[PDB]
Tab-separated table of C-alpha atoms in Angstrom:
chain	number	residue	atom	x	y	z
A	1	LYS	CA	-16.686	-25.293	-13.428
A	2	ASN	CA	-13.045	-23.905	-13.181
A	3	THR	CA	-11.517	-24.765	-16.603
A	4	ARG	CA	-8.056	-23.194	-15.808
A	5	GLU	CA	-7.543	-25.319	-12.617
A	6	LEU	CA	-8.839	-28.526	-14.337
A	7	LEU	CA	-6.333	-28.119	-17.220
A	8	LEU	CA	-3.464	-27.374	-14.756
A	9	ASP	CA	-4.274	-30.611	-12.848
A	10	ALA	CA	-4.414	-32.408	-16.258
A	11	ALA	CA	-1.040	-30.826	-17.198
A	12	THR	CA	0.828	-32.014	-14.010
A	13	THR	CA	-0.711	-35.546	-14.301
A	14	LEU	CA	0.202	-36.031	-18.035
A	15	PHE	CA	3.706	-34.501	-17.543
A	16	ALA	CA	4.366	-36.939	-14.653
A	17	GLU	CA	3.144	-39.954	-16.699
A	18	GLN	CA	4.991	-39.377	-20.032
A	19	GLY	CA	7.166	-36.207	-19.687
A	20	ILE	CA	6.771	-32.613	-20.953
A	21	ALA	CA	8.623	-32.918	-24.366
A	22	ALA	CA	6.265	-35.795	-25.474
A	23	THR	CA	3.015	-34.108	-24.206
A	24	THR	CA	1.297	-31.480	-26.454
A	25	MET	CA	-1.090	-28.780	-25.136
A	26	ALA	CA	-3.766	-30.279	-27.480
A	27	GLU	CA	-3.444	-33.660	-25.633
A	28	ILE	CA	-3.840	-31.998	-22.148
A	29	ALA	CA	-7.127	-30.293	-23.246
A	30	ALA	CA	-8.513	-33.492	-24.891
A	31	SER	CA	-7.709	-35.644	-21.765
A	32	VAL	CA	-10.341	-33.645	-19.742
A	33	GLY	CA	-12.814	-33.169	-22.659
A	34	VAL	CA	-12.025	-29.439	-23.079
A	35	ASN	CA	-11.613	-27.616	-26.463
A	36	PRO	CA	-7.885	-26.857	-27.270
A	37	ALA	CA	-8.964	-23.185	-27.768
A	38	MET	CA	-9.319	-22.865	-23.945
A	39	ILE	CA	-5.720	-24.033	-23.084
A	40	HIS	CA	-4.192	-21.356	-25.409
A	41	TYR	CA	-6.583	-18.770	-23.864
A	42	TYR	CA	-5.275	-19.331	-20.270
A	43	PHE	CA	-1.654	-20.009	-21.420
A	44	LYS	CA	-0.429	-17.869	-24.399
A	45	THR	CA	2.851	-19.852	-24.911
A	46	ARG	CA	4.053	-23.379	-23.971
A	47	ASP	CA	6.622	-21.613	-21.703
A	48	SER	CA	3.753	-19.718	-19.932
A	49	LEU	CA	2.187	-23.073	-18.859
A	50	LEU	CA	5.533	-24.274	-17.356
A	51	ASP	CA	5.913	-20.967	-15.396
A	52	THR	CA	2.398	-21.509	-13.909
A	53	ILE	CA	3.371	-25.160	-12.965
A	54	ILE	CA	6.517	-23.833	-11.166
A	55	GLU	CA	4.521	-21.061	-9.352
A	56	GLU	CA	1.028	-22.587	-8.666
A	57	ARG	CA	1.957	-26.293	-8.328
A	58	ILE	CA	5.724	-26.910	-7.656
A	59	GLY	CA	6.141	-23.670	-5.630
A	60	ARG	CA	3.117	-24.442	-3.399
A	61	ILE	CA	4.568	-27.981	-2.745
A	62	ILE	CA	8.079	-26.527	-2.033
A	63	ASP	CA	6.674	-23.829	0.353
A	64	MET	CA	4.501	-26.335	2.353
A	65	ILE	CA	7.649	-28.539	2.927
A	66	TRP	CA	10.016	-25.644	3.953
A	67	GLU	CA	7.539	-23.085	5.529
A	68	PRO	CA	7.376	-24.768	9.073
A	69	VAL	CA	11.204	-24.264	9.159
A	70	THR	CA	12.234	-21.315	11.398
A	71	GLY	CA	15.595	-20.421	12.991
A	72	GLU	CA	14.317	-20.753	16.599
A	73	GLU	CA	14.025	-24.634	16.779
A	74	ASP	CA	15.465	-25.811	20.143
A	75	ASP	CA	16.049	-29.415	18.879
A	76	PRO	CA	17.653	-29.969	15.400
A	77	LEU	CA	16.732	-33.718	15.446
A	78	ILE	CA	12.954	-32.884	15.729
A	79	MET	CA	13.405	-30.321	12.848
A	80	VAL	CA	14.830	-33.037	10.502
A	81	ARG	CA	12.223	-35.692	11.699
A	82	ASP	CA	9.405	-33.229	10.766
A	83	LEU	CA	11.018	-32.372	7.369
A	84	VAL	CA	11.305	-36.145	6.442
A	85	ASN	CA	7.616	-36.664	7.481
A	86	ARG	CA	6.427	-33.638	5.395
A	87	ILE	CA	8.307	-34.862	2.246
A	88	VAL	CA	6.934	-38.490	2.379
A	89	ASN	CA	3.365	-37.290	3.382
A	90	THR	CA	3.292	-34.826	0.383
A	91	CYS	CA	4.591	-37.505	-2.118
A	92	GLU	CA	2.059	-40.082	-0.744
A	93	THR	CA	-0.872	-37.608	-1.345
A	94	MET	CA	0.487	-36.062	-4.623
A	95	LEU	CA	1.852	-39.082	-6.576
A	96	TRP	CA	2.922	-36.851	-9.552
A	97	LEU	CA	5.633	-35.048	-7.468
A	98	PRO	CA	8.370	-37.862	-7.225
A	99	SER	CA	7.958	-38.823	-10.940
A	100	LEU	CA	8.029	-35.164	-12.207
A	101	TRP	CA	11.094	-34.508	-9.938
A	102	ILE	CA	13.366	-37.135	-11.657
A	103	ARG	CA	12.031	-36.417	-15.228
A	104	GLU	CA	12.159	-32.587	-15.290
A	105	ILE	CA	14.304	-31.289	-12.343
A	106	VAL	CA	17.136	-33.875	-11.713
A	107	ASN	CA	17.475	-34.743	-15.479
A	108	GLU	CA	19.860	-32.425	-17.451
A	109	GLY	CA	17.347	-32.243	-20.351
A	110	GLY	CA	14.447	-31.309	-18.058
A	111	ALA	CA	12.208	-28.355	-19.011
A	112	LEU	CA	11.561	-27.292	-15.371
A	113	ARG	CA	15.330	-27.464	-14.421
A	114	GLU	CA	16.259	-23.802	-15.341
A	115	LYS	CA	12.937	-22.318	-14.010
A	116	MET	CA	13.420	-24.190	-10.690
A	117	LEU	CA	16.710	-22.289	-9.926
A	118	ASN	CA	14.900	-18.908	-9.647
A	119	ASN	CA	12.330	-20.431	-7.159
A	120	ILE	CA	14.655	-22.228	-4.623
A	121	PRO	CA	13.791	-21.424	-0.910
A	122	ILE	CA	17.391	-20.130	-0.318
A	123	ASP	CA	16.267	-18.106	2.787
A	124	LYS	CA	14.681	-21.091	4.664
A	125	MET	CA	17.448	-23.507	3.479
A	126	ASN	CA	20.088	-21.161	4.994
A	127	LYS	CA	18.050	-21.180	8.269
A	128	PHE	CA	18.005	-25.031	8.214
A	129	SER	CA	21.802	-25.209	7.492
A	130	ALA	CA	22.525	-22.624	10.246
A	131	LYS	CA	20.409	-24.499	12.880
A	132	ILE	CA	22.014	-27.897	12.070
A	133	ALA	CA	25.552	-26.268	12.060
A	134	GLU	CA	24.763	-24.676	15.490
A	135	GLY	CA	24.138	-28.220	16.804
A	136	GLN	CA	27.574	-29.291	15.467
A	137	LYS	CA	29.209	-26.399	17.435
A	138	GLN	CA	27.308	-27.461	20.627
A	139	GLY	CA	28.353	-31.091	19.945
A	140	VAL	CA	24.804	-32.517	19.819
A	141	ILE	CA	25.040	-33.100	15.975
A	142	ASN	CA	27.784	-35.204	14.199
A	143	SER	CA	30.807	-32.988	13.317
A	144	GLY	CA	31.618	-35.159	10.249
A	145	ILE	CA	28.482	-34.362	8.198
A	146	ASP	CA	28.072	-31.149	6.104
A	147	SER	CA	25.206	-28.721	7.003
A	148	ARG	CA	24.649	-27.782	3.284
A	149	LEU	CA	24.921	-31.333	1.770
A	150	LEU	CA	22.423	-32.733	4.386
A	151	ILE	CA	19.517	-30.984	2.501
A	152	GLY	CA	20.370	-33.014	-0.645
A	153	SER	CA	20.901	-36.215	1.426
A	154	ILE	CA	17.395	-35.959	3.067
A	155	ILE	CA	15.797	-35.207	-0.381
A	156	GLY	CA	17.677	-38.186	-1.907
A	157	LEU	CA	16.832	-40.645	0.911
A	158	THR	CA	13.086	-39.736	0.839
A	159	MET	CA	12.207	-38.783	-2.804
A	160	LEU	CA	14.296	-41.386	-4.791
A	161	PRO	CA	12.771	-44.632	-3.200
A	162	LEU	CA	9.236	-43.460	-4.165
A	163	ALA	CA	10.402	-42.456	-7.684
A	164	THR	CA	12.061	-45.905	-8.225
A	165	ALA	CA	9.136	-47.844	-6.570
A	166	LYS	CA	7.853	-49.253	-9.948
A	167	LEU	CA	11.446	-50.336	-10.827
A	168	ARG	CA	12.114	-52.329	-7.561
A	169	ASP	CA	8.580	-53.911	-7.860
A	170	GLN	CA	10.038	-55.653	-11.011
A	171	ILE	CA	13.343	-56.913	-9.380
A	172	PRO	CA	12.736	-60.460	-7.878
A	173	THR	CA	14.671	-60.262	-4.531
A	174	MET	CA	13.645	-56.611	-3.844
A	175	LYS	CA	9.783	-56.466	-4.007
A	176	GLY	CA	7.678	-56.232	-0.810
A	177	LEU	CA	8.359	-52.785	0.769
A	178	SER	CA	5.788	-49.963	1.505
A	179	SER	CA	5.922	-46.080	2.071
A	180	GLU	CA	5.830	-46.872	5.858
A	181	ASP	CA	8.566	-49.581	5.512
A	182	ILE	CA	10.894	-47.000	3.813
A	183	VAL	CA	10.240	-43.980	6.198
A	184	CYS	CA	11.320	-46.265	9.167
A	185	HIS	CA	14.605	-47.096	7.304
A	186	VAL	CA	15.433	-43.389	6.451
A	187	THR	CA	14.675	-42.225	10.063
A	188	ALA	CA	16.847	-45.047	11.574
A	189	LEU	CA	19.678	-44.295	9.069
A	190	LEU	CA	19.653	-40.452	9.471
A	191	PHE	CA	19.608	-40.510	13.273
A	192	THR	CA	21.731	-43.547	14.393
A	193	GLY	CA	23.407	-44.638	11.111
A	194	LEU	CA	24.726	-48.203	10.739
A	195	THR	CA	26.458	-48.473	14.205
A	196	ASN	CA	24.025	-50.058	16.773
A	197	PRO	CA	23.084	-47.738	19.735
B	1	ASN	CA	40.165	-46.883	-33.443
B	2	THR	CA	36.956	-45.570	-35.119
B	3	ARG	CA	34.603	-48.007	-33.221
B	4	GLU	CA	35.836	-46.885	-29.733
B	5	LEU	CA	35.797	-43.148	-30.744
B	6	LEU	CA	32.130	-43.393	-31.876
B	7	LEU	CA	31.158	-45.348	-28.707
B	8	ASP	CA	32.737	-42.579	-26.540
B	9	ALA	CA	30.852	-40.026	-28.728
B	10	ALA	CA	27.613	-42.049	-28.237
B	11	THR	CA	27.809	-42.119	-24.369
B	12	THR	CA	28.776	-38.370	-24.253
B	13	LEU	CA	25.896	-37.196	-26.570
B	14	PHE	CA	23.352	-39.512	-24.836
B	15	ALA	CA	24.385	-38.045	-21.412
B	16	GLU	CA	24.079	-34.434	-22.751
B	17	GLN	CA	20.814	-34.577	-24.827
B	18	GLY	CA	19.332	-38.089	-24.238
B	19	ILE	CA	18.974	-41.129	-26.541
B	20	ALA	CA	15.503	-40.453	-28.178
B	21	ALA	CA	16.676	-36.946	-29.369
B	22	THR	CA	20.154	-38.129	-30.594
B	23	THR	CA	20.434	-39.709	-34.106
B	24	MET	CA	23.288	-42.045	-35.163
B	25	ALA	CA	24.095	-39.468	-37.925
B	26	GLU	CA	24.692	-36.784	-35.212
B	27	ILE	CA	27.074	-39.096	-33.201
B	28	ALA	CA	29.255	-39.705	-36.323
B	29	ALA	CA	29.297	-35.974	-37.308
B	30	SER	CA	30.296	-34.878	-33.726
B	31	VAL	CA	33.711	-36.663	-34.148
B	32	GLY	CA	34.119	-35.843	-37.894
B	33	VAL	CA	33.425	-39.438	-39.031
B	34	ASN	CA	31.246	-40.433	-42.067
B	35	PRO	CA	27.764	-41.812	-40.993
B	36	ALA	CA	28.577	-44.911	-43.127
B	37	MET	CA	31.055	-46.042	-40.407
B	38	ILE	CA	28.519	-45.978	-37.468
B	39	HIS	CA	26.097	-48.311	-39.363
B	40	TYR	CA	29.094	-50.558	-40.263
B	41	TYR	CA	30.018	-51.196	-36.568
B	42	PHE	CA	26.380	-51.132	-35.342
B	43	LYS	CA	23.808	-52.747	-37.700
B	44	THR	CA	20.703	-51.500	-35.765
B	45	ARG	CA	19.987	-48.629	-33.301
B	46	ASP	CA	19.164	-51.402	-30.746
B	47	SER	CA	22.657	-52.989	-31.298
B	48	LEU	CA	24.298	-49.668	-30.249
B	49	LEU	CA	22.260	-49.630	-26.960
B	50	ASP	CA	23.208	-53.305	-26.254
B	51	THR	CA	26.918	-52.357	-26.733
B	52	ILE	CA	26.446	-49.362	-24.293
B	53	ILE	CA	24.891	-51.750	-21.677
B	54	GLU	CA	27.689	-54.385	-22.175
B	55	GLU	CA	30.892	-52.343	-22.933
B	56	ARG	CA	30.113	-49.088	-21.011
B	57	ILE	CA	27.372	-49.548	-18.302
B	58	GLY	CA	28.213	-53.217	-17.523
B	59	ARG	CA	31.960	-52.527	-17.118
B	60	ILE	CA	31.133	-49.602	-14.745
B	61	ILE	CA	28.601	-51.747	-12.753
B	62	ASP	CA	31.079	-54.703	-12.506
B	63	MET	CA	34.038	-52.521	-11.306
B	64	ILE	CA	31.791	-51.085	-8.484
B	65	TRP	CA	30.366	-54.481	-7.281
B	66	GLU	CA	33.261	-56.934	-8.182
B	67	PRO	CA	35.436	-56.241	-4.988
B	68	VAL	CA	32.342	-57.276	-2.901
B	69	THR	CA	32.682	-60.870	-1.556
B	70	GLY	CA	30.788	-62.667	1.234
B	71	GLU	CA	33.861	-63.072	3.499
B	72	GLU	CA	34.194	-59.371	4.709
B	73	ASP	CA	35.005	-59.380	8.453
B	74	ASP	CA	33.875	-55.717	8.857
B	75	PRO	CA	30.568	-54.559	7.230
B	76	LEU	CA	31.412	-50.809	7.679
B	77	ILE	CA	34.704	-51.169	5.690
B	78	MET	CA	32.633	-52.854	2.911
B	79	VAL	CA	30.176	-49.879	2.772
B	80	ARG	CA	32.952	-47.130	2.865
B	81	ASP	CA	34.864	-48.979	0.020
B	82	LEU	CA	31.601	-49.167	-2.034
B	83	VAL	CA	30.927	-45.392	-1.457
B	84	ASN	CA	34.567	-44.578	-2.500
B	85	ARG	CA	34.298	-46.711	-5.698
B	86	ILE	CA	30.976	-45.021	-6.749
B	87	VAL	CA	32.263	-41.403	-6.284
B	88	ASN	CA	35.748	-42.220	-7.830
B	89	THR	CA	34.050	-43.748	-10.960
B	90	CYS	CA	31.585	-40.771	-11.354
B	91	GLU	CA	34.493	-38.255	-10.879
B	92	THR	CA	36.473	-39.929	-13.746
B	93	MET	CA	33.434	-40.759	-15.994
B	94	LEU	CA	31.190	-37.633	-15.777
B	95	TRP	CA	28.571	-39.151	-18.214
B	96	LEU	CA	27.577	-41.919	-15.702
B	97	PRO	CA	25.369	-39.934	-13.131
B	98	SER	CA	23.713	-38.111	-16.099
B	99	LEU	CA	22.927	-41.285	-18.179
B	100	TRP	CA	21.693	-43.104	-14.984
B	101	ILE	CA	18.883	-40.531	-14.263
B	102	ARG	CA	17.918	-40.019	-17.973
B	103	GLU	CA	17.498	-43.647	-19.196
B	104	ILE	CA	17.221	-46.178	-16.305
B	105	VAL	CA	15.661	-44.205	-13.314
B	106	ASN	CA	13.258	-42.433	-15.798
B	107	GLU	CA	10.179	-44.527	-16.842
B	108	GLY	CA	10.616	-43.415	-20.498
B	109	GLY	CA	14.224	-44.610	-20.704
B	110	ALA	CA	15.593	-46.674	-23.622
B	111	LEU	CA	18.197	-48.489	-21.427
B	112	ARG	CA	15.637	-49.190	-18.601
B	113	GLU	CA	14.477	-52.651	-19.924
B	114	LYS	CA	18.011	-53.766	-21.057
B	115	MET	CA	19.506	-52.863	-17.613
B	116	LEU	CA	17.161	-55.368	-15.785
B	117	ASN	CA	18.877	-58.364	-17.483
B	118	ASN	CA	22.367	-57.041	-16.419
B	119	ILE	CA	21.794	-56.314	-12.638
B	120	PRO	CA	24.530	-57.855	-10.345
B	121	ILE	CA	21.836	-59.773	-8.336
B	122	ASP	CA	24.458	-62.337	-7.083
B	123	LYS	CA	26.878	-59.733	-5.569
B	124	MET	CA	24.008	-57.510	-4.252
B	125	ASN	CA	22.587	-60.564	-2.375
B	126	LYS	CA	26.113	-61.106	-0.900
B	127	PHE	CA	26.188	-57.426	0.228
B	128	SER	CA	22.650	-57.684	1.782
B	129	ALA	CA	23.577	-61.000	3.500
B	130	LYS	CA	26.837	-59.566	5.007
B	131	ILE	CA	25.092	-56.411	6.335
B	132	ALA	CA	22.144	-58.567	7.693
B	133	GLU	CA	24.707	-60.883	9.423
B	134	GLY	CA	25.994	-57.798	11.285
B	135	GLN	CA	22.404	-57.023	12.419
B	136	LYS	CA	22.114	-60.591	13.862
B	137	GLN	CA	25.479	-60.154	15.704
B	138	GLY	CA	24.267	-56.726	16.932
B	139	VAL	CA	27.157	-54.719	15.425
B	140	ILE	CA	24.839	-53.133	12.736
B	141	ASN	CA	21.605	-51.126	13.502
B	142	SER	CA	18.566	-53.481	13.673
B	143	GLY	CA	16.234	-50.687	12.420
B	144	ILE	CA	17.695	-50.326	8.894
B	145	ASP	CA	16.806	-52.715	5.996
B	146	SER	CA	19.629	-54.789	4.366
B	147	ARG	CA	17.980	-54.558	0.872
B	148	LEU	CA	16.949	-50.828	0.984
B	149	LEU	CA	20.520	-49.806	2.082
B	150	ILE	CA	21.783	-50.493	-1.526
B	151	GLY	CA	19.329	-47.846	-2.851
B	152	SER	CA	20.181	-45.445	0.040
B	153	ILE	CA	23.989	-45.614	-0.725
B	154	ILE	CA	23.279	-45.131	-4.501
B	155	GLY	CA	20.989	-42.144	-3.679
B	156	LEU	CA	23.435	-40.482	-1.221
B	157	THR	CA	26.391	-40.788	-3.672
B	158	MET	CA	24.949	-40.579	-7.254
B	159	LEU	CA	22.252	-37.806	-6.798
B	160	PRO	CA	24.651	-34.979	-5.506
B	161	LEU	CA	26.860	-35.466	-8.633
B	162	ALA	CA	23.771	-35.589	-10.946
B	163	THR	CA	22.488	-32.263	-9.428
B	164	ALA	CA	26.040	-30.673	-9.392
B	165	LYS	CA	25.273	-28.376	-12.411
B	166	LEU	CA	22.060	-27.221	-10.600
B	167	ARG	CA	24.013	-26.526	-7.325
B	168	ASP	CA	26.642	-24.516	-9.298
B	169	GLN	CA	23.922	-22.012	-10.362
B	170	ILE	CA	23.098	-21.363	-6.619
B	171	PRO	CA	25.417	-18.819	-4.809
B	172	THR	CA	25.052	-20.138	-1.185
B	173	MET	CA	25.339	-23.796	-2.412
B	174	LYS	CA	28.507	-23.230	-4.581
B	175	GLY	CA	31.954	-24.540	-3.587
B	176	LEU	CA	31.280	-28.117	-2.345
B	177	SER	CA	33.922	-30.346	-4.005
B	178	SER	CA	33.787	-34.111	-4.633
B	179	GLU	CA	36.048	-34.960	-1.611
B	180	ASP	CA	33.518	-33.002	0.532
B	181	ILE	CA	30.710	-35.328	-0.720
B	182	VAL	CA	32.423	-38.666	0.202
B	183	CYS	CA	33.260	-37.324	3.780
B	184	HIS	CA	29.627	-36.204	4.494
B	185	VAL	CA	28.037	-39.486	3.162
B	186	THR	CA	30.558	-41.664	5.170
B	187	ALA	CA	29.890	-39.689	8.427
B	188	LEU	CA	26.085	-39.882	7.810
B	189	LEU	CA	25.982	-43.653	6.942
B	190	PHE	CA	28.260	-44.603	9.918
B	191	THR	CA	27.120	-42.380	12.892
B	192	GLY	CA	24.068	-40.511	11.500
B	193	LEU	CA	23.084	-37.139	13.015
B	194	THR	CA	23.193	-38.240	16.715
B	195	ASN	CA	26.148	-38.197	19.168
B	196	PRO	CA	26.281	-40.000	22.612
């Protein structure tokens, strides 16, 4: 059926398992039993494939996480609760996303790092930072936290435990924690912190 | 000291372009030293990595977890001191957040396997026991996990410094200094987003 979509799904899977630099376009085609002549037909250069990953795979994942964000939310605490849920639910369905995030975005030698910068949802992130800062002015949100740095904090608290899941499964006094066991921890930490209510 | 100069050159080049891509001939040439000297101090490529784990990573890991005892009377002072020691170390040694993501967090890392046999399991168990003791007393939130908090603190402190170069290429995200990071993370870990 659709050869282009099959090879893009094969590209994201192989890049998440062993990295971009190590994976050749000949390997991606062979992994789905497709002739390497077809991968160069849909993607002229190696750079053209990465641009399609950023637009038709990464971009679609980034938009579905930040699109329900408006500037009219009446409760900032519901807005963050929903964002945390959408990040963990996306990573639980699309297992390639947390692994590809550390390897190619966070890493300084990542191939998708530079291309990512020109596809950041700056408009909806500014709306999130404005809504959470409005809550700080009203006194319903903690005055000590930073409205801009909170985006990074939420991403770090949700994405990193799933990316390091295989690593903690190897540490003796650390193994025995699920996707549900982690989301409870992040929600309890973001809302109440360490001081008991 | 040629040995120390080449070890500083090794950690810098591995943080900039990775281990797999960096040759021992490139490390020696980057400091104007003959490649005959790097094989003199480090017999194998594996010996160089073991020295990085013992004399560079290990020293950094020990100085962050050594002030942690089991006798802390206040668990929140213990977490704010830990946060301060992580950010202060990363601010002085810029290669640390970079080398952490590239070779231990990453599944294809060269230091990943060697790091497992140098984890401060004893002092981490003391941290998890002290924070769990606070949960029993009812002074610490019962909802959070004593073991997962270690990862949470590492994630809240290490990741913003690892993504600093990425943030710097964003206009609306530019300006946030290192002192701004430690204040946000402390206010988030202590009180969270809610107010009474």
